[PDB]
Structure formats: C-alpha cells, structure tokens
Amino acid sequence: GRLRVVVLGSTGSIGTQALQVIADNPDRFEVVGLAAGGAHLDTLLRQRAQTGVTNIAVADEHAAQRVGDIPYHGSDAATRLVEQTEADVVLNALVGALGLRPTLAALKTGARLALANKESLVAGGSLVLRAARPGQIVPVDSEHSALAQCLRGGTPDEVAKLVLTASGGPFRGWSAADLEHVTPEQAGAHPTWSMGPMNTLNSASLVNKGLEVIETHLLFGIPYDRIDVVVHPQSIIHSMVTFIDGSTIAQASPPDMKLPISLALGWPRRVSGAAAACDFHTASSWEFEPLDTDVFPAVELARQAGVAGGCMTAVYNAANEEAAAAFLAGRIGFPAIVGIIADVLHAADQWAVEPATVDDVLDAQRWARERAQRAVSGM
Amino acid sequence: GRLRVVVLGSTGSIGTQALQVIADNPDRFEVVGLAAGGAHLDTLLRQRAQTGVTNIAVAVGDIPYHGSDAATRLVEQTEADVVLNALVGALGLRPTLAALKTGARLALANKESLVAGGSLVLRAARPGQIVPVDSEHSALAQCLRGGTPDEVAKLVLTASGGPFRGWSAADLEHVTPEQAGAHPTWSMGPMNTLNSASLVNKGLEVIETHLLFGIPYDRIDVVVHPQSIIHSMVTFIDGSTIAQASPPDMKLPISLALGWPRRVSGAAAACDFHTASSWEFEPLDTDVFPAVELARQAGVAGGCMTAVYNAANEEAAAAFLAGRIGFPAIVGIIADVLHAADQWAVEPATVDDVLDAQRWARERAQRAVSGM
Ligand SMILES: [Mn+2]
Numbered sequence: 001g002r003l004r005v006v007v008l009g010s011t012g013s014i015g016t017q018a019l020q021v022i023a024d025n026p027d028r029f030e031v032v033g034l035a036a037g038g039a040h041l042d043t044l045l046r047q048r049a050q051t052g053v054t055n056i057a058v059a060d061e062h063a064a065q066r067v068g069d070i071p072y073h074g075s076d077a078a079t080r081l082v083e084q085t086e087a088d089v090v091l092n093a094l095v096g097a098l099g100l101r102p103t104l105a106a107l108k109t110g111a112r113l114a115l116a117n118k119e120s121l122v123a124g125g126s127l128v129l130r131a132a133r134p135g136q137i138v139p140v141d142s143e144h145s146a147l148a149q150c151l152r153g154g155t156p157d158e159v160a161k162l163v164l165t166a167s168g169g170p171f172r173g174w175s176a177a178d179l180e181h182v183t184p185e186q187a188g189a190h191p192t193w194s195m196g197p198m199n200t201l202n203s204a205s206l207v208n209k210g211l212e213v214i215e216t217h218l219l220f221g222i223p224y225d226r227i228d229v230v231v232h233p234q235s236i237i238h239s240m241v242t243f244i245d246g247s248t249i250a251q252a253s254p255p256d257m258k259l260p261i262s263l264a265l266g267w268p269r270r271v272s273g274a275a276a277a278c279d280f281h282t283a284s285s286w287e288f289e290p291l292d293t294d295v296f297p298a299v300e301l302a303r304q305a306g307v308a309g310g311c312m313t314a315v316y317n318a319a320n321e322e323a324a325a326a327f328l329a330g331r332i333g334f335p336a337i338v339g340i341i342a343d344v345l346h347a348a349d350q351w352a353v354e355p356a357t358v359d360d361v362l363d364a365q366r367w368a369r370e371r372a373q374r375a376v377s378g379m
Numbered sequence: 380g381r382l383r384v385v386v387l388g389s390t391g392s393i394g395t396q397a398l399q400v401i402a403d404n405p406d407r408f409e410v411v412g413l414a415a416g417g418a419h420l421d422t423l424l425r426q427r428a429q430t431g432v433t434n435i436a437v438a439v440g441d442i443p444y445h446g447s448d449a450a451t452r453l454v455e456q457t458e459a460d461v462v463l464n465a466l467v468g469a470l471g472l473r474p475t476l477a478a479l480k481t482g483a484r485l486a487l488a489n490k491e492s493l494v495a496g497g498s499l500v501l502r503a504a505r506p507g508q509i510v511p512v513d514s515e516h517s518a519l520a521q522c523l524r525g526g527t528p529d530e531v532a533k534l535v536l537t538a539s540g541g542p543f544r545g546w547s548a549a550d551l552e553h554v555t556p557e558q559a560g561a562h563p564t565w566s567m568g569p570m571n572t573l574n575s576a577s578l579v580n581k582g583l584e585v586i587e588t589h590l591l592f593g594i595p596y597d598r599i600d601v602v603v604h605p606q607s608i609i610h611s612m613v614t615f616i617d618g619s620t621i622a623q624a625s626p627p628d629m630k631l632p633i634s635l636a637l638g639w640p641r642r643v644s645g646a647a648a649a650c651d652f653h654t655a656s657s658w659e660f661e662p663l664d665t666d667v668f669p670a671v672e673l674a675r676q677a678g679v680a681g682g683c684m685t686a687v688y689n690a691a692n693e694e695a696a697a698a699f700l701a702g703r704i705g706f707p708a709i710v711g712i713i714a715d716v717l718h719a720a721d722q723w724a725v726e727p728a729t730v731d732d733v734l735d736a737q738r739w740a741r742e743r744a745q746r747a748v749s750g751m
C-alpha cells in the first residue's frame with residue numbers, strides 16, 4: 001500500500017510541494033530518493049536532514065568541492081539514482097535537458113513516471129513513448145491532469161475532442177498592432193535571469209500552450225486536429241474532454257498544484273485533502289472565449305511541428321528558447337519570436353525523422369539553436 | 380448489440396425524443412413496445428404508423444393492451460433489454476416494478492418510482508439496473524466515473540433557479556400561476572413547470588440522487604447555474620471537481636440511458652467554444668426556497684416520508700393553480716404535512732402502503748388548503 005517515491009528536481013516548486021503532500025500522507029507514500037542540481041545543494045541538504053533520506057543525488061557536475069558525503073554526483077547522476085533505486089513512482093520535476101535521460105531510465109525500471117519535465121515529451125517525443133507501457137506516464141501539469149481525469153468519462157473510441165484551457169496570458173485580447181512594441185517587462189518577464197522569464201514569456205507568447213498541445217498529443221494519442229485550446233481567464237476549469245455523444249466532462253478546482261501532484265503520485269487513487277475544492281457558497285463566473293489564432297499563431301505552429309513529428313517538436317522548442325532569449329535581450333520584437341520559430345521549422349525538413357537515440361534529439365536542438373541564432377542576427 | 384426498447388409514456392417530451400434517438404440509431408436500438416395514457420392517442424397512433432410497432436398499450440380499436448394496468452401488462456409480456464419509463468405520476472410505479480422483475484435495464488424518467496416507491500423500488504432492483512434519464516442524474520452518473528465511491532466528497536446538483544431566482548418571500552406572495560409559468564387556462568398537468576418555480580423539482584431530484592447513488596443527504600448540495608450548461612458535478616476527497624457540460628438537450632441523457640454504458644454518437648450538439656460564453660454559479664437562497672431542505676428532511680426521515688413530500692406538493696400545487704392559495708403556501712403546506720407525518724417514517728412493504736401514504740398526504744394537504 002505504501003508507494004516508494006523518487007523525487008527528481010526536489011528543490012523546485014513542484015518538488016517541494018510533492019514532499020509536503022508526502023509528509024502529509026506517510027501512510028500512502030515513502031520518499032526513497034531525492035535529486036537536484038549542484039546549484040541547489042544547500043536546499044537538498046536541508047531536505048536530506050528533514051526527510052532522513054540519505055539516497056540523494058546531485059544531478060550535475062556542480063558543487064563539486066562540496067560533494068563527499070553525497071552518494072551520486074556528476075552530469076547524469078539523477079539517471080543513476082533512478083536506475084539503482086527500487087521505487088513505485090518517479091516524480092521527474094527536473095528542469096529542461098536534465099530531465100530527459102532520467103525519464104528514460106525511470107520508464108525502463110517499470111515504475112510509474114509522474115512527469116513534470118516538459119522537455120521529456122516536447123523534445124524526447126517518440127523516444128519517451130517508445131520506452132513506456134500504456135498508462136505508465138502520469139502527467140503532473142494542471143491541464144494534462146484534468147484531461148487524464150476527464151478521459152475517465154468514456155472509452156478511447158468515444159473521445160471526440162480534447163479541450164485545453166488557457167489563461168490567455170497578459171496579452172489576452174490585445175491586437176497585433178498593440179503587441180508590436182511590447183517589452184519583456186510588459187510580458188511579465190524581468191530580464192535578470194533568462195530563467196523565470198522563460199516560463200513567463202512562454203505564457204505571454206502562447207508558446208507554453210503550444211508545448212502543452214504537443215504533450216497532450218503524445219500523452220493521450222489524440223490527433224492534433226482534435227486538440228483544441230480555449231481561453232478561460234479564471235483557470236478554474238483546468239481542461240475538458242468532449243465525447244462523441246455531445247457530452248463534455250470537465251475538471252475544476254481553485255489553482256493549486258498539490259492537486260495534480262497528489263494525483264500523479266497516487267494514480268489511480270485520489271489523495272484525501274490534497275487541495276481545496278471549488279466553493280459554491282459564493283457567486284462566481286467561469287468565462288470562455290476563443291483564442292485569437294491570427295494574433296497568437298504559436299499554438300497552430302506547435303500543431304504543424306507536431307504533425308511533422310520526430311524531432312520537429314524539439315526544433316520548435318529550441319528555436320523558441322533562442323528567439324525568446326533574443327526578445328528578452330532587446331534584440332528582436334515580441335511578434336518576431338513566433339516568426340523565428342516558423343522560419344526555423346520551414347528549414348527543418350531533415351528533423352522530421354524519429355530520433356534513434358538521445359544524441360539525435362540533442363543534434364536537432366543544437367541545429368535549431370544555430371538556425372534561430374542566424375534568424376535573430378538577420379534582423 | 381442491438382437493444383430491444385420498450386418506451387413507456389411515448390407521446391410526451393422524453394418519449395418522442397427517445398423515439399427520434401432510436402430512429403437515428405437502428406443499429407443500436409429497436410423499438411418493441413409503446414405505452415401512453417390515451418389523451419394523446421392521436422400521437423400514439425401516429426407513432427404506431429411510423430415505428431411499425433403494433434405492441435402498444437393505452438395506459439381503442441385493435442390495441443393489444445388497454446385499461447388501468449395496460450402499461451404494466453405490456454412490460455410483463457414483452458421481451459426487451461431496456462424499459463424506458465417516461466410515464467408521469469402514479470402511472471409509472473407499477474410498470475417500474477414490473478420492469479425490474481423482468482431483469483431488463485430500466486431507463487428511469489418517472490420521478491414517482493423513486494420518490495414515492497423508495498425502498499420498495501430499490502429492493503426490486505439489482506445494482507446498476509436502474510439508469511437515470513434526468514439531466515442532473517445522468518451528469519452525476521458520468522462524473523462518478525471520476526473516482527471510486529470512497530473518493531466521493533459531495534454531489535453537486537445544478538439548478539436553473541427557476542423564474543423567481545432573486546425574488547423575495549414578499550415578491551412571491553402575489554405571483555399568479557401565469558407568472559410561475561404554469562398556465563391554468565390550458566393546463567394539461569403543469570407540475571414540472573410549477574415544481575421548477577417552487578424548487579420542489581430540485582428537492583425531488585435531491586431525493587432521487589440519494590436513492591440512485593447511495594450518498595448521504597448532508598453530502599448532496601445544490602447550486603444555482605442559470606445557463607443550465609453544467610448539468611451537475613461531483614467533488615472528490617482530493618478537492619477535484621468533475622462536471623458534465625452540454626447545451627441543454629435531453630437526447631444526450633436519453634441516449635446514454637438507453638445505451639448504458641456506451642455513448643451514442645451524434646446524440647446531441649457539444650459545447651462550442653468558438654464563441655464566447657459565461658457559466659455563472661450562485662448560492663440558492665434557502666430562506667426564500669426551503670423546498671430542497673424539506674426534501675432532505677423527508678429523505679432523512681425516510682420510509683414513506685418522500686411519498687408524503689411529493690403527494691402534499693401535488694395537492695397544494697393543484698390548489699394554487701385553481702386560485703385557492705398563494706404561491707409560498709405550496710411549500711408551506713408541504714412542511715405542514717411533513718410536521719404531522721411522524722407515522723410515515725416506516726418503510727413501505729407493498730404498493731398500497733405507498734398509496735396509503737399519498738392519500739393521507741393529499742387529504743391532510745386539503746385541510747391545510749381549506750384552512751389557508
Ligand atoms: Mn500548464
């Protein structure tokens with residue numbers, strides 16, 4: 001009954017929330033491994049002290065002078081922790097490139113993968129799916145968790161549409177003209193990291209929703225032309241599934257990542273008291289509006305990339321990272337971000353092939369960066 | 380996998396929509412029987428002509444079944460997989476029991492069966508045999524797929540709030556039957572409309588919910604949702620709510636009741652998110668509309684108390700329609716009858732035990748009417 005959990009990226013937002021859910025539910029979960037990059041060593045050490053878990057990994061080569069009591073350390077150490085630790089669930093909340101090999105390792109162990117890391121599916125794609133058995137991956141993100149729950153409303157042949165909700169970001173309802181000269185700061189990003197501005201900038205450009213559409217396709221096997229995005233400013237409905245009979249099933253809760261985190265850890269079993277429910281004691285409104293796809297072409301571009309397949313979604317994301325960096329630096333305008341992604345994709349016919357290995361993913365990403373760098377330098 | 384369907388109450392709203400669903404899906408369904416009250420004999424004979432079904436009951440030339448218990452007789456003697464009981468009022472109870480005895484799936488629309496029949500109908504049913512047709516119950520059934528029973532925290536029924544949403548008790552004192560949507564100048568039995576205005580319909584659905592899904596009354600909530608796009612919701616122990624949403628259209632829950640657990644392709648239009656929309660939620664004013672709490676009170680007391688609740692409603696509601704009492708007195712009389720109904724908390728053993736409760740309620744309600 002007590003699930004053994006390995007928590008990768010333990011020091012970030014998702015990881016720390018996951019450890020709180022586990023601490024609150026010692027009957028259901030036992031932490032048996034922790035991993036984080038060397039920059040976060042001090043937090044990781046506090047976590048070892050707090051949890052009593054000595055099976056911990058420094059996930060990269062960094063903090064090298066301060067490791068000597070640490071069982072795993074070095075570039076791919078999180079992967080080794082996964083390979084060597086008996087577990088029922090691996091929560092992969094590592095950020096970016098670091099997440100891919102541990103994902104593949106976790107799947108190979110036969111454990112459930114509670115997946116938070118977007119790169120695994122967006123860049124890894126069929127590499128990750130190739131390694132997974134049906135139902136082995138349980139998504140952690142709010143939208144995908146909603147979809148997984150909503151799909152309980154019918155059999156796979158009964159699914160008509162997956163409908164992802166989107167907040168619409170800070171520029172919801174802005175015209176193309178209004179968006180021409182917006183600054184990084186107006187997009188909610190404050191160019192002093194190129195780290196936290198990334199997730200935030202992706203929310204403004206609607207690239208994050210593009211990525212979520214890609215993940216949806218890979219997680220659930222629904223064609224891109226049956227994955228819709230609908231703007232829902234309250235973010236209370238987290239996503240919905242429309243069935244062939246006309247019924248839609250939706251999942252709703254006040255925003256709180258502890259809900260989807262808990263469900264990913266305990267799947268298929270719900271965790272009592274994970275998060276507050278919607279309170280109908282008070283009057284409220286749930287609003288829906290269509291996405292403006294002329295103004296926000298990032299989502300359709302993700303569908304185009306996803307339809308092409310193979311390493312194309314890795315190219316989409318890597319071109320975005322580069323173009324986003326350029327906008328944050330003041331080098332290009334806001335609308336040029338998705339323009340650059342489209343131009344790189346146009347040139348990326350060689351990257352439709354399925355990756356044989358991780359190296360092919362890495363090669364596609366390298367190529368996309370150089371290509372986006374070229375596009376940026378040209379304007 | 381073609382299902383044989385008996386349609387009871389075929390000439391009303393639910394029956395005609397069901398026949399259309401069946402006509403559109405001959406590979407899934409086949410009509411094998413029709414039953415109607417006789418008032419709409421014109422429709423029924425029109426339905427005979429179009430369906431081919433001669434196996435018909437009038438609940439009268441060469442009609443195989445006619446009389447008071449004709450629908451019950453039709454059910455007992457027709458081989459079917461599904462019985463759709465869309466009869467209204469007292470008419471639906473014996474055919475429900477007869478349908479359950481056959482072992483066929485009962486696609487239940489008739490509110491009388493559970494509200495009045497109660498434990499008597501539940502004891503005649505195997506678990507899973509009754510599939511609800513009402514939009515709220517269909518939605519709850521779908522949303523319950525969101526977890527195991529031990530994970531259910533609350534059932535949340537949505538309610539339009541009716542025409543008097545936002546009104547005061549004082550506002551209600553001077554409403555016409557006309558104003559309440561139940562036109563007494565041409566009435567054919569406008570109980571559902573009046574019940575929507577008084578919130579008694581919601582009270583009846585709360586009782587039905589408890590009996591269908593075995594969830595305690597203190598965990599069945601009602602929220603007002605004017606759009607009627609979300610048809611009901613389930614909140615689970617982790618704080619997740621699963622909702623069922625669709626543009627209002629009874630063909631959706633009808634199709635699913637007939638084909639349970641399999642969905643019927645193209646039954647109804649889906650929510651269209653190409654155009655902007657708002658789904659509003661507001662609390663029910665339980666001071667002005669205590670009919671739902673009264674239903675919970677009666678449901679908790681149990682036994683024949685829910686049959687008393689509904690029969691007292693009908694009698695008070697008939698009196699309002701005649702211009703004999705005011706609007707707020709409908710639910711006032713229900714409460715008055717319930718307060719004196721101490722005796723009826725005993726479980727019914729026979730149909731006549733229920734009819735006795737109903738007669739008692741009707742009679743006691745009359746005395747309150749002649750008093751008010
Ligand atoms: Mn998300």
Ligand SMILES: [Mn+2]
Pocket residue numbers: 513514515584
């Ligand atoms: Mn209803």
